[PDB]
Symmetry: D3
Subunit: 92 residues, 6 copies
């Protein structure tokens, strides 16, 4: 019960602060959908290119799944940083 | 005219690819608004706390404007990485 | 009351999980002290070098306060990522 | 012999500077232990959850091993940046 | 035709701006070669160390392929950021 | 004398390893020059735009000096990571 009071640095949050935090998480949900849509686009692009050696090589050289994972990590850690600016923990 | 053909690594893009790139940029616009709203919340929070030394010190120790700038940078570079997974340049 | 239940994705945490999260925050406190000690070392190094144009230029070219801020940000976001691996939110 | 004199930008370091660098590396060792402890906690949590499809899915959706690797990388590169602020190389 | 005019935020670029962007991409090509050379050095180092358990363990503990991938990602995203400072998109 | 032997995790380096490390630092020097050239381009672009309110606003909204600093940091930390893959310290 009231587990945030047991975690160091965590302060009591107003409803306004919880509302802004939830708004960030929700916009992130739409990014999750977009990233899923991009990942589906990549699978189909790779699928359509089977036995086109030159296009398979181009895709593999561009490394789009790796760049999609990089972008996902940046979106999530950016979310975390925005939520930190709102929630403002009392610890390093 | 057709400046993308003069830039190394840039390939011709389909309308589908341009549409997905534009979708990322649009979701980013909503993040820009959210970040602006958070920045306004911080100014008012700081303003309401003037001449409350303890609360001003708490805010300054939490560094929320710095965390908001960190989150903004991560959101923008994540966008850039997602768009790269879609546009797939032909260069390192 | 019980504000974590109002935030999206947050799940109930066991005492074991809260204990590990607190351990990360505590090791971070020691890093905060170390960073403070480094920052003090830099002020004194700069102070001792006043009116040694060549050494002031060397320090300014090395940009150590900027590198100290970079390292601090990486330590804090690494902490955040470790705590996320423990707390495991249910959201993107 | 004296290999640091063959590497560009490296300057001679005082014992005080070597001591501060070693202090960062030591605090990192404690983080390494903590990360190992978290990784063990994750293996056991996954192990205890075998044949609980819903809990296995929750863990896989939270991606905690990926977040633990992200946090480890941030801790190590933060260490590198702090040590750079101390050692102050003479190169870009 | 003229696909940059269909992408949000993209502005018309001068030849001077395209020239600077291409210069960044070219210096990146040399980094790509260097990274390839390092990767070859690692394969040979690992190869020469087969059935030297202690040296194989040392290499695996140092994780150099992981650090090489980290450095590659930083070089590429740094390139992207420099090119953004030149091309200056009109979007978040 | 032989200060690398006093720093934890540092191992003796072959001449081949020092040569590869120096090659990274040298390619970084060329990036430093490029970044300086970009920074000069930005000053002149801003200078030429004085008392063109709309173009000054466009430049300020694009934040190119901030993006140039982001790219510089990524180039330097990427260099650090590549050099780590070569030098392979024996510490976390
Ligand atoms: N005004 C203006 N700005 C432009 C134009 N083209 C690019 N920019 C800007 O430069 C940034 C970096 O470009 P890049 O060389 O890294 O290539 C990009 C990048 O890898 C990835 C994400 O792009 P974005 O997040 O929009 O960042 C771009 C922008 O800020 O997609 C790559 N990419 C971009 N365009 C293409 C393309 N036509 N084909 C393949 N890959 C592409 C410009 O015209 N105007
Ligand atoms: N004062 C105060 N601050 C709070 C409270 N709850 C969170 N914060 C702050 O927001 C940061 C980001 O939160 P998040 O939505 O990203 O969720 C976190 C994060 O993914 C990961 C690491 O947390 P931390 O490094 O402490 O950063 C947190 C903090 O600065 O753990 C996630 N997480 C946090 N709490 C929970 C939970 N109860 N269940 C699951 N995951 C959690 C707060 O109450 N007060
Ligand atoms: N003036 C001066 N500066 C020095 C000296 N030694 C190191 N520095 C500076 O500290 C930074 C961080 O060092 P590190 O403890 O993280 O170890 C480095 C790092 O992991 C990786 C990349 O190094 P670099 O990008 O040059 O950053 C180094 C530099 O700015 O290589 C590791 N590494 C460095 N030297 C060795 C070694 N001899 N053996 C094994 N690994 C090494 C110094 O003497 N003078």
């Amino acid at each position: 019960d009231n587990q945030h009071k047991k975690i160091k640095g965590y302060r009591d949050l107003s409803q306004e602060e919880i509302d802004m935090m939830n708004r960030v998480k929700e916009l992130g949900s739409q990014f999750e959908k977009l990233i899923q849509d991009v990942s589906d686009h990549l699978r189909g692009q790779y699928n359509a290119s089977l036995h086109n050696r030159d296009e398979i090589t181009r895709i593999a050289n561009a490394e789009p799944g790796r760049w999609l994972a990089i972008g996902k990590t940046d979106i999530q850690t950016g979310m975390m940083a925005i939520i930190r600016a709102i929630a403002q923990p009392d610890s390093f």
